[PDB]
Amino acid sequence: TRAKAKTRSSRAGLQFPVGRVHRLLRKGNYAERVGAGAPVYLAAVLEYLTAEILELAGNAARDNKKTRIIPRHLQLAVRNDEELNKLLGRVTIAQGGVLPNIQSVLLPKKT
Amino acid sequence: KPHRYRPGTVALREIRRYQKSTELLIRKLPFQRLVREIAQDFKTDLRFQSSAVMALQEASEAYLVALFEDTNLCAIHAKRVTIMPKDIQLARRIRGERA
Amino acid sequence: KPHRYRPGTVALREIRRYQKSTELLIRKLPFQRLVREIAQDFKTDLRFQSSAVMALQEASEAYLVALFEDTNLCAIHAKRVTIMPKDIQLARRIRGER
Amino acid sequence: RKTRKESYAIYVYKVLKQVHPDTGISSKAMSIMNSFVNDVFERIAGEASRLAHYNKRSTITSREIQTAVRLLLPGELAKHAVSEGTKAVTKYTSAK
Amino acid sequence: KTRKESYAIYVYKVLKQVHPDTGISSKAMSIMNSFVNDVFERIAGEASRLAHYNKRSTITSREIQTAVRLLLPGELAKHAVSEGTKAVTKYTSA
Amino acid sequence: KLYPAIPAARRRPIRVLSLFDGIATGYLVLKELGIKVGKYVASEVCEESIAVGTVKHEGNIKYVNDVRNITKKNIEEWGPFDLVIGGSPEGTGRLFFEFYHLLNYSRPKEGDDRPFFWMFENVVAMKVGDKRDISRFLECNPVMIDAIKVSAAHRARYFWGNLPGMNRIFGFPVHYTDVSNMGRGARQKLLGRSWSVPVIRHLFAPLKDYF
Amino acid sequence: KVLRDNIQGITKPAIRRLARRGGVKRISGLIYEETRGVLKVFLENVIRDAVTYTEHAKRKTVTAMDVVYALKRQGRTLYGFGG
Amino acid sequence: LRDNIQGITKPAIRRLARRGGVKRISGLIYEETRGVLKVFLENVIRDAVTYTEHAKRKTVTAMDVVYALKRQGRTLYGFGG
Ligand SMILES: [Cl-]
Ligand SMILES: [Cl-]
Known part of the structure; x- marks a missing residue:
């Protein structure tokens, strides 16, 4: 062949690898046939979710005055968002702890 | 002359201090001994990666912190601020783990 | 005046009567109307098999009965015999659906 | 000694630079993002495979992944x- | 009409093998068929996951055994x- | 209270006074109203909005270096204003009281038939005492519009103003939502741009019938 | 016709019967509205998933298999209608 | 080889409860909590050792504990996956 080897990631305008996603859909024993729109679409979805979470985590790093995302920042990024909490309610993130949540009746009556 | 705080203020101070921190609260070596003791009753001469025991500790402490969260909600619901084994049993019962 | 029971005795009698029975307690047709009403906000002109609505009713009544079981445990835990929306919210919160 | 365990680490870092160009990330948080990508991947490919088995089909296309995303x-x-x-x-x- | 397969006669056979006089209704037959399909899918799922974890592509009795010991x-x-x-x-x- | 509508044969340009805004929304949204601007006067304490204005907005805007500089003489010299808007990208009370003081200078006197419109914006995380005080100062009740029809975030907002049709008219669209979904920074534009462009054009929709 | 106000079709005695099967002795008055809310949100999730399964099956009739797959997906496996 | 459940100390359970937001802890909490933790660890280590048995190995990897916790519906991030 004589052609510029344009990868399917760049062909789809994406960053996550369509080839690795495609060969994991093949090796992962999900169906007999696996298309091309399926790994393109799935790389797009995964890139969007990774983008949104790393966005919120960079935001929580900024709020913590840091330029390196730690586990705690992923923890805050997921658990302070409602839909990421719905996505990962049954998921433990290590080295993250919990949100700084203190109930109202446990506080002293500062009135 | 010696200063002493009220109970609620140091209690809330520790609540804040440990809800801000991320480090593992159970010590590493007694948890490792507990893991080997429980493992012993399944197969003799079992070995463990360090990251395996760290994963066990991360998940165990996260599980107990969610458990104490639900236990505190049971206590607060029962017009108390003191958690009780009643509250732990109610929490585990509603979560479906009583088996 | 005619005979009249205490509240606890007819209450426990109904608790016994309905924990023995197996029939669907929600009526079929208003539940079907509720299902069509909720479905309406997803696609217009949706059709439903009869066994689909029966499956929805079986699962919905089973879910609400497990909910009232946890709600009764919340009530009893709070030194009460009366279920409250406090108890329903505590149940759903501990179950993780809030 | 020749074994390469694959990961999404460079791709998570590239998407991070394309979102926050001045913010880095630790290796523990990189592992958490890697396992999140692997997890969500397995979830969507799982649901897609289930859907394909349900609808008597053997070809996973973009529509199967699409309704798996709309579910998950x-x-x-x-x-x-x-x-x-x-x-x-x-x-x-x-495209070209 | 395409024949929708079932485990119904096999549930009836094992029922006669455990209660020779007791019958079963068709809705309870549907519940038993659905239980068998469900537990089948659970064990074959966990066993497929076991084969994938250990980088294997052959499901033998050991994968099903470890799946049953899990579930x-x-x-x-x-x-x-x-x-x-x-x-x-x-x-x-044999 | 209902105000009479002048017919659309009288096409006079709109004079706007926008007081606090990070990314300049009002002049751009007025450019996509389909109508021309009479006077658009902006001001900001920081220099970020001044930099955004001197790069993007082509210099058709009269800027003031500080909000503490605008007096009654500047309002009477720079023409009467038709619209007055106050928003934001414990200084919120400071922003409101500077807004209300500049609003008292731009309000027409008893006898003028000029159509006057104003708007103030802040979210529902305000203290309820500040809310009831602002309701006393503006003589208007806020409307609690939540980001639950178009969004899922727990960021609701109170609105104050003199806008016709602002009680319960806002609902969820599907076409505008669909066209606004296509971004990898979809929810960052939801947090900022969805509060900037669509809600403001939705509330300032009926002004084109006036002018 | 657009169907409306069908959540009131879950009547007060039906909620009381459901409470009796759950073992509840005494029922307060706000239980009925709260229960209609919870059942509404449950049916929202379940019917949403079942409608989605209908959408991908290129059909317009929600089968019982769709509702079974949906309930099963949410970790509440329903026996009696297949699976 | 029996006081290993007592290695989960009363300060450590108190720190855990502080992270959970608990203000006051009764004395009967600690033995109950050791019990519940022991039952959770029994289920998890049982599954992980089962997975080790299937791999014909003698050591329990972190991937085994991840797979076990994932099977039990408590997915753990940061240990491979
Ligand atoms: Cl395709
Ligand atoms: Cl007790």
């Missing part, structure tokens, strides 16, 4: 991911 | 491992 992501996150995915499949099917 | 709690696991190893001996020595 909660609401508006699903709407944004179905839009982003359909946009990337549009760009893919009409 | 069935305690004594159900031990008695199903006993009955299954019994039937695999009876199969390989």
